[PDB]
Design an enzyme around this catalytic site. Sequence first.
Site, PDB file in Angstrom:
ATOM      1  N   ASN A   1      -0.705   7.410  13.913  1.00 27.42           N
ATOM      2  CA  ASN A   1       0.069   8.704  13.129  1.00 27.42           C
ATOM      3  C   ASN A   1      -0.414   9.775  13.980  1.00 27.42           C
ATOM      4  OD1 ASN A   1       1.011   7.985  10.482  1.00 27.42           O
ATOM      5  ND2 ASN A   1      -0.936   7.816   9.359  1.00 27.42           N
TER       6      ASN A   1
ATOM      7  N   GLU B   1      14.276 -13.728  18.035  1.00 26.39           N
ATOM      8  CA  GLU B   1      14.356 -12.980  19.424  1.00 26.39           C
ATOM      9  C   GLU B   1      13.603 -11.902  19.805  1.00 26.39           C
ATOM     10  OE1 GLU B   1      18.599 -12.880  19.695  1.00 26.39           O
ATOM     11  OE2 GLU B   1      18.567 -12.424  21.962  1.00 26.39           O
TER      12      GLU B   1
ATOM     13  N   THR C   1      -5.741  -1.571   0.514  1.00 25.50           N
ATOM     14  CA  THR C   1      -4.706  -2.618   0.066  1.00 25.50           C
ATOM     15  C   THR C   1      -3.762  -2.810   1.355  1.00 25.50           C
ATOM     16  OG1 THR C   1      -4.355  -1.381  -2.045  1.00 25.50           O
ATOM     17  CG2 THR C   1      -2.624  -2.948  -1.048  1.00 25.50           C
TER      18      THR C   1
ATOM     19  N   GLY D   1       0.857  -1.288   0.015  1.00 28.27           N
ATOM     20  CA  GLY D   1      -0.057   0.048  -0.078  1.00 28.27           C
ATOM     21  C   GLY D   1       0.984   1.143  -0.015  1.00 28.27           C
ATOM     22  N   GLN D   2       0.026   2.456  -0.142  1.00 28.12           N
ATOM     23  CA  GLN D   2       1.113   3.632  -0.124  1.00 28.12           C
ATOM     24  C   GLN D   2       1.656   3.755   1.109  1.00 28.12           C
ATOM     25  OE1 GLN D   2      -0.526   8.377   0.099  1.00 28.12           O
ATOM     26  NE2 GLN D   2      -1.535   7.139  -1.228  1.00 28.12           N
TER      27      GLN D   2
ATOM     28  N   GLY E   1      -6.040   1.727   4.784  1.00 24.49           N
ATOM     29  CA  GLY E   1      -5.954   1.643   3.388  1.00 24.49           C
ATOM     30  C   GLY E   1      -6.428   0.162   3.000  1.00 24.49           C
TER      31      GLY E   1
HETATM   32  N1  LIG Z   1       2.661   7.673   8.457  1.00 21.27           N
HETATM   33  C1  LIG Z   1       2.268   7.363   7.128  1.00 21.27           C
HETATM   34  N2  LIG Z   1       0.728   7.327   7.005  1.00 21.27           N
HETATM   35  C2  LIG Z   1       0.290   7.265   5.703  1.00 21.27           C
HETATM   36  C3  LIG Z   1       1.195   7.220   4.750  1.00 21.27           C
HETATM   37  N3  LIG Z   1       0.264   7.104   3.522  1.00 21.27           N
HETATM   38  C4  LIG Z   1      -0.842   6.947   3.921  1.00 21.27           C
HETATM   39  N4  LIG Z   1      -0.971   6.642   5.216  1.00 21.27           N
HETATM   40  C5  LIG Z   1      -2.121   6.291   6.283  1.00 21.27           C
HETATM   41  O1  LIG Z   1      -2.666   5.268   5.646  1.00 21.27           O
HETATM   42  C6  LIG Z   1      -4.036   5.523   5.614  1.00 21.27           C
HETATM   43  C7  LIG Z   1      -4.789   5.122   4.215  1.00 21.27           C
HETATM   44  O2  LIG Z   1      -3.942   3.923   3.908  1.00 21.27           O
HETATM   45  P1  LIG Z   1      -3.224   3.850   2.271  1.00 21.27           P
HETATM   46  O3  LIG Z   1      -1.758   3.559   2.426  1.00 21.27           O
HETATM   47  O4  LIG Z   1      -3.405   5.113   1.831  1.00 21.27           O
HETATM   48  O5  LIG Z   1      -4.161   2.991   1.508  1.00 21.27           O
HETATM   49  P2  LIG Z   1      -3.452   1.790   0.673  1.00 21.27           P
HETATM   50  O6  LIG Z   1      -2.624   0.817   1.299  1.00 21.27           O
HETATM   51  O7  LIG Z   1      -2.843   2.241  -0.728  1.00 21.27           O
HETATM   52  O8  LIG Z   1      -4.912   1.010  -0.027  1.00 21.27           O
HETATM   53  P3  LIG Z   1      -5.755   1.476  -1.022  1.00 21.27           P
HETATM   54  O9  LIG Z   1      -7.016   1.729  -0.334  1.00 21.27           O
HETATM   55  O10 LIG Z   1      -5.833   0.663  -2.324  1.00 21.27           O
HETATM   56  O11 LIG Z   1      -5.199   2.914  -1.547  1.00 21.27           O
HETATM   57  C8  LIG Z   1      -4.621   6.710   6.082  1.00 21.27           C
HETATM   58  O12 LIG Z   1      -4.744   6.613   7.603  1.00 21.27           O
HETATM   59  C9  LIG Z   1      -3.188   7.640   5.940  1.00 21.27           C
HETATM   60  O13 LIG Z   1      -3.045   8.526   7.063  1.00 21.27           O
HETATM   61  C10 LIG Z   1       2.503   7.572   4.772  1.00 21.27           C
HETATM   62  O14 LIG Z   1       3.012   7.697   3.893  1.00 21.27           O
HETATM   63  N5  LIG Z   1       2.984   7.779   6.109  1.00 21.27           N
HETATM   64 MG   LIG Z   2      -3.745   3.744  -2.721  1.00 20.54          MG
END
Ligand SMILES: Nc1nc2c(ncn2[C@@H]2O[C@H](COP(=O)(O)OP(=O)(O)OP(=O)(O)O)[C@@H](O)[C@H]2O)c(=O)[nH]1
Ligand SMILES: [Mg+2]
Lengths: 425, 347, 54, 438
Positions: free
Chosen positions: D206, D254, D145, D10-11, D143
Site C-alpha cells: 500500500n 503457466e 479476516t 476481507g475488506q 486484516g
Molecule cells: N489497497 C487497499 N488496502 C486496504 C483496503 N481495505 C483495507 N486495506 C488494508 O488492509 C489492512 C487491514 O485489513 P482489512 O481488509 O481491513 O481486514 P479484514 O480482512 O476485513 O479482517 P477484519 O480484521 O475481520 O476486519 C490495512 O493495512 C489496510 O490498509 C482497500 O480497499 N485497498
Molecule cells: Mg473488517
Amino acid sequence: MREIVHIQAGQCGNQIGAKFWEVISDEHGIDPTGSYHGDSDLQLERINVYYNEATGNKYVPRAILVDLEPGTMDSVRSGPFGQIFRPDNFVFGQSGAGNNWAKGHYTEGAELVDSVLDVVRKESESCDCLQGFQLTHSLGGGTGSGMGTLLISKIREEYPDRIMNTFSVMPSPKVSDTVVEPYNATLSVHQLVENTDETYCIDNEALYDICFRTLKLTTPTYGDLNHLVSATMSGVTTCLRFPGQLNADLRKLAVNMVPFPRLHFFMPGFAPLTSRQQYRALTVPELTQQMFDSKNMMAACDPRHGRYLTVAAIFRGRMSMKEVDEQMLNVQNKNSSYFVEWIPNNVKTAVCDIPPRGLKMSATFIGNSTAIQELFKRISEQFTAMFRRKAFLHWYTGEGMDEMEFTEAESNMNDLVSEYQQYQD
Amino acid sequence: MYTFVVRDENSSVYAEVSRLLLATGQWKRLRKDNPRFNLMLGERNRLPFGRLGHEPGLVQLVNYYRGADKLCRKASLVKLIKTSPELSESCTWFPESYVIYPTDEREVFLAAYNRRREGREGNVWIAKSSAGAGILISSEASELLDFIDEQGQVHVIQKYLEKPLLLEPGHRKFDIRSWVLVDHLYNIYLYREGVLRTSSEPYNSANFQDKTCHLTNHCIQKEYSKNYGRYEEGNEMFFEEFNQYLMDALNTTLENSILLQIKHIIRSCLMCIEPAISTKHLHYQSFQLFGFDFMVDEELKVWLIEVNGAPACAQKLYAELCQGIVDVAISSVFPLASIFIKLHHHH
Amino acid sequence: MEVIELNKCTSGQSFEVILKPPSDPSLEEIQKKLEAAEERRKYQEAELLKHLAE
Amino acid sequence: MRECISIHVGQAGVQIGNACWELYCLEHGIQPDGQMPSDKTIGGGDDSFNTFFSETGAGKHVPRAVFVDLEPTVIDEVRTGTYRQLFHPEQLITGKEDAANNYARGHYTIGKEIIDLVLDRIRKLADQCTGLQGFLVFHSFGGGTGSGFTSLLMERLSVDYGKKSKLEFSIYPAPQVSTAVVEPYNSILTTHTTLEHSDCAFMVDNEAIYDICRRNLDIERPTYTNLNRLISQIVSSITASLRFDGALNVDLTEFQTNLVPYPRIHFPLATYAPVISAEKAYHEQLSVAEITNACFEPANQMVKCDPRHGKYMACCLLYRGDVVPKDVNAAIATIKTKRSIQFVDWCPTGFKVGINYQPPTVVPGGDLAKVQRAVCMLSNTTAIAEAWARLDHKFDLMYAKRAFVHWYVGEGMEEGEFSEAREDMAALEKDYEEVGVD
Ligand SMILES: Nc1nc2c(ncn2[C@@H]2O[C@H](COP(=O)(O)OP(=O)(O)OP(=O)(O)O)[C@@H](O)[C@H]2O)c(=O)[nH]1
Ligand SMILES: [Mg+2]
Ligand SMILES: Nc1ncnc2c1ncn2[C@@H]1O[C@H](COP(=O)(O)OP(=O)(O)CP(=O)(O)O)[C@@H](O)[C@H]1O
Ligand SMILES: Nc1nc2c(ncn2[C@@H]2O[C@H](COP(=O)(O)OP(=O)(O)O)[C@@H](O)[C@H]2O)c(=O)[nH]1
Ligand SMILES: [Ca+2]
Ligand SMILES: [Ca+2]
Ligand SMILES: [Ca+2]
Ligand SMILES: [Mg+2]
Ligand SMILES: [Mg+2]
C-alpha cells in the site's frame, strides 16, 4: 448493526452519563423527546450503536441508569433529556451506599444487582450484534464504585466474550467528598484490572486544574467538571458513532491499544479548551500542540514522565487530512524519546467530518501511557497513609469485609505500578 | 529539529560529524535502534538498506552507498575494471592485476608472468587481500601463489611499481591519499587537502624481504620503521609542502603533474558505478566519503592502488573536512536555520 | 538476441527474447488443529468462570 | 476453455475485487445488468472471457467470483452498488462480527464456524466448470479476516482441489493507510501457513500504491477508491491473458512455470507504467522504450525495493495497446546496455513478452488518464525479500516483549505458532540470500 449497552451507576456516573447522552443526542440530531430532527445522513448511519429504534421513528438510548438512592436519578428524569430514557431502565434503591465501597459491592448493592442484570439482559436480547458495554461511574464513592464493579463482574460472567469498557472518575483530595475515597478507589482499580478491556481514567484533579488554570473559572463546580467529561466522552466515541475503519468497533480498538491485558488504562485528552478569544479559528498545528500538551489531558499525569505504549487521535471537522498527517508525524518525530520503540507505528489517527456542536474543528486524544502509574501511586500512597493506622476501617469491617482484603487490594495496585514501570524502561 | 542515529562507534570521521551536528543545536541524536531518524551513520558491514525509506513523512539519508563495495574491495575492484567497458581491460592508470583464489585468474597470471620473465623485464609482483591488517612481495611466481594457498581468503596479485617516485632527501617511497565526498545528487567533491603517507626508510629494490621501505602504511612505519617522524611529522606530508618540493626539484606543480590525473581517475571510477549505486529515484538518499590511494612513478604517472570505503582522516584535517561533510552532504538535504573541488560530469 | 515462439492472433501476439543462455495436511489433520484451538478457548473460559465462581 | 474462480476475502479483498470486476465489465463490453451485446452465443459458449464469466439463459454474464467477509458492512456495498445485478446472493457471504485485526480470531474462532459454508458456495461455482484451472484469492495481510481466514481457506482448497492452482493478490501492510498495530503479526502468521498452499502470489505494498497516487496522480491524501482503481489496473494486466485470446500465460499453471522456478520463492515483483493523471491538460504519449524503461524505475513498483541489488529468476513483459515486437526488442536491447540486470546463473537471461492490442481501459470519471500503450513487468527478484526483512523486523520488535500476544492466545492459538511462523520466514529470507548474493 454493532450495538453498545450503556450503564451509568451512582451519583457521578449518572450526572456524567446524563450530560453524555445530552451531548451526543444533539450531534445525532435527536431532540429531548427522541425525535430525529437533523439534516445529515451521517447522523443516522450508526445511530443504532447507542439508540434503539421504537415505534413512530423514535430513538431511545440504550442506557441503563442505576443507583442505590433515588435522589440523582430523579434529577436526570427531570433534566433536559430526562424524558428520552426508557422508563424501565431506571433501576434504583432507597438505602444509598454512603460512600462505602463495601455497601455497594457486598451488602446494599447485591440486593439490587439482579434487577439491573434483568434490564441488561433485556437490552442485549434485542441487539442484532452486541459489541460490548460501557459504564460511567466514579471510583471514590459507594454505588458507582462498589456496585459498579459488582455489575462489571456479573456482566462479565454472563457475557464473557463481550468487550467491557468504562469511563472511570478517579478521586482527588482537591475535589473530595469524603476521606475514604482512597479506600474505595483502590478496591475498584483491582476489579478493573481484572474485568475491563478499556478504562478511560478521568482524574477530578486534572479536570479541576483545567477549569481553574486553563478555562479561567474562578470557582469550578461539578457541572463545570462534567462539561469536560461530556466533550471527552463524545470525542472517544466518535469512531464508533460515525463511519470509519480506524477503531471501528470496541474490540478492534482494544486490540490496537492494549499490548498487555492489565495495562488498559488510558489518558483522555481534548482540544481546544478556550476561555470566554473564543471565536478564533484553530489551525491544525494548534490542535496538535494542545492535544499532546499535558495541560489538555485529564488523568493528571505528565506524559513526559513516562512513555506512550499506544496513541489514538481523532480529528473532527472539515480540515486538511494531508495537514493532519504532517502535524501528527511532526509530534512523533520531534518527541520520539516518549514513544516505545518496540511497537512500530503505535500512533494511529482518525478523521471525522462532523464537528462537535459550536466548533469548527476539534481533536480528542486517547493515550495508553506508562505515566498513568503516577495516578495509581497517588491513590496507593493516600490508601497506605490511612491503612497503616487502620483509620476508617470500621465502616468497612462493619459491612463484612476483612482487613486481609484491603492488604490484597493494596498489593494488587502496587503490582500494577511495578508493571507500568518495567515497560517504561 | 532534525534527528540522527549512530551505528559505527569506531568511526573517527563521523564521530566528529556527530559532535558538530549537536553543536548546531538543531540536530538530536536518538538510540541506534530508533527507526524515526533523518540521518543514519550506519555500520560498515551489513547495513540494513532494506529498512531505509519506509517511514511516513521522514526523508531518510544514509552515509553509505549500497553497492559501493564493488569499488572498495580488492578483488571486486579488479573485476570491475576488467569487465566494465567504461574502464576496459586496457585501463592505463591501474596496475596489471589478477584475482587469485586459494572466476580464478591463475593461468592468465602465469602467462603474463612467463612473458615478462622471458623478455628480461622487471618481474616483481605483490600479493595482497582485503582480510589483511598480510602482504608478500616477490619476483618468483612460485612464492606468490604458494603464499596465497597458505591462507583461506581471496587474494589479488598485481604488478609492483618498481620505479616509484622517490622524495629527496631520503630516497623513500610514498602514496597519496585523496578524500572524495559524493552527495545524494551524485556530485563528486574532491577535498582540497590531501596527504602523502611517506616511508622514512630509503627505497631498496634489491631486498623485498624487509617490507618497511616498500609499504607506506601509517601503521607499519610507526611500528617497524626506525626513522619515523624524521623528515615530516608522522610521515605525513601535506599538499603545500609537496607542491613546493615539486617546483624546486622537478620544475612543475602538484596540479599539473599529478592532481589532473587523480581527478580523472576519481571521475572514471565513480561515474562507472553511478548507474548501479545512484539513489536519484530511490526512496532514500545516500552519500559517502571515499579514500583513494594513489602511487606515482618516476615518470610522474599516477596509479590507482585501492579505494577505501570507510577511510579515516589525517589528524590535522578532521575539522575542515568533517565541517565540509555537514555543509555539502547533510545540510544540503536538511538545511539549517568551498573546501572541496567539484568534479563535473554527465549524469 | 534471438526471438522465439512468435504467436500471433487477431487480438495480440506473444514471443520470447533470449539475450544469453543459462550457465499437505489432510481434512482430519485440519479439524484437529481447529478443534484443539477451540478446546483451549473452552479451557480458558472454564478458568474464568471458576474464578468468578470463587 | 478452462474456468478460473476468484475469491475475495476481507475488506481489502472485497473492495479490490469490486474494482476489478467493474473494470472487467468495461473491458469485455459488459453492462451492470449483466448483458453483453457483443456475445452472440446466448446462454453459453467457450470464449476466453468465459473463463471469468458464466452465462444464463437470459443472456447475463455472471462473474465466477465469491466474496467472503466476517462482517456485512462492506459486502453490503456490493449488494446495493452499481453492479448489484451481476452477482447473485449465494456469491456474497458475510458474518456478523469481524476478526478484530486478530489473525487467530479469523483463522480459529470465527473461521471454524463459517469455513464449511464458504467451501460449499465455492463448490457451487466449481460445479458449473467443465475444466476448472484454479482460484485467484484477493486479501490483505493485516486484516484479521484477510490474514486469518484466508490461510484456512487455502488449506481446505488444497484438500478439496488438490490438482488445482491457486494464485494470490495480497496487500502488504503500510502504516500510512493502516490503523492496526498487529499487522506484522498477521502478515507473518498468514504467510507461514499459506506458503505451501500458494503457487504464485503478487504482493502489493500500500505504501507503493499510496506514493504513486500522490506523485503521478497528484492526490494529496489518496483514498481506498484511489488505491483500488489503480490496483485493479495492475490486476487486469496480470489476468488479461486468461480473459483474452493469446498464447502467453493462458492458464494459471503457466504463471508458476514462467515466474516461479523455486516453489517457496513465488512472490514476483510487479511494475506498471505509465500512470498519468486524468486532470492533466494533456500528456505526451510515451513510447515503447520509455514505458519499458520505466519498468526498472523503483518509483512505479508495487513494492519498494532495489532490483539492482538482487538477481532475476524470471521476467514477463505484458504490454497493452499500440506495441509491436520490433519496438519491444529495440527498447530491451537499449536497457541491457544501461541498467543493472543480473540474472541467476541457473536461469536464462530472457524476457517472455505478451502484447494485447486493446489499450488499457480506464473507468469513466476515474483518476487515470487514457493512454495508447502501457506495460506491466512481472519479474522474480531476490530484492523483494527486502519486504520480508522490513516485516520480519517489526515482528521481532513486538514479539521480544510478547506485546499483543494475549489477544491471539485468547482465541485458542498457541504461542509456539508465533515462533514457528517466524522461524519459517527466517528460512524464507535465507533462501532469497542463497539465490541472490555471492
Ligand atoms: N489497497 C487497499 N488496502 C486496504 C483496503 N481495505 C483495507 N486495506 C488494508 O488492509 C489492512 C487491514 O485489513 P482489512 O481488509 O481491513 O481486514 P479484514 O480482512 O476485513 O479482517 P477484519 O480484521 O475481520 O476486519 C490495512 O493495512 C489496510 O490498509 C482497500 O480497499 N485497498
Ligand atoms: Mg473488517
Ligand atoms: N602494485 C603496487 N606497486 C607498488 N606499491 C604497492 C602496490 N600495491 C601496494 N603497494 C604499497 O602498499 C601500500 C598500500 O597497500 P594496500 O592499500 O594494498 O593495503 P591496505 O588497503 O591494507 C592499506 P590502505 O587501505 O590504508 O590504503 C602502499 O603504500 C603502496 O606503497
Ligand atoms: N467529575 C465528577 N465527579 C463527581 C461528580 N459527582 C461526584 N463525583 C466524585 O465521585 C466521588 C464520589 O462518588 P459518588 O458518585 O458521589 O458516589 P456514589 O453515588 O455512591 O456512586 C468523589 O470523588 C466526587 O469527587 C460529578 O458530577 N462529576
Ligand atoms: Ca436491605
Ligand atoms: Ca457466449
Ligand atoms: Ca497444492
Ligand atoms: Mg455524592
Ligand atoms: Mg583497504
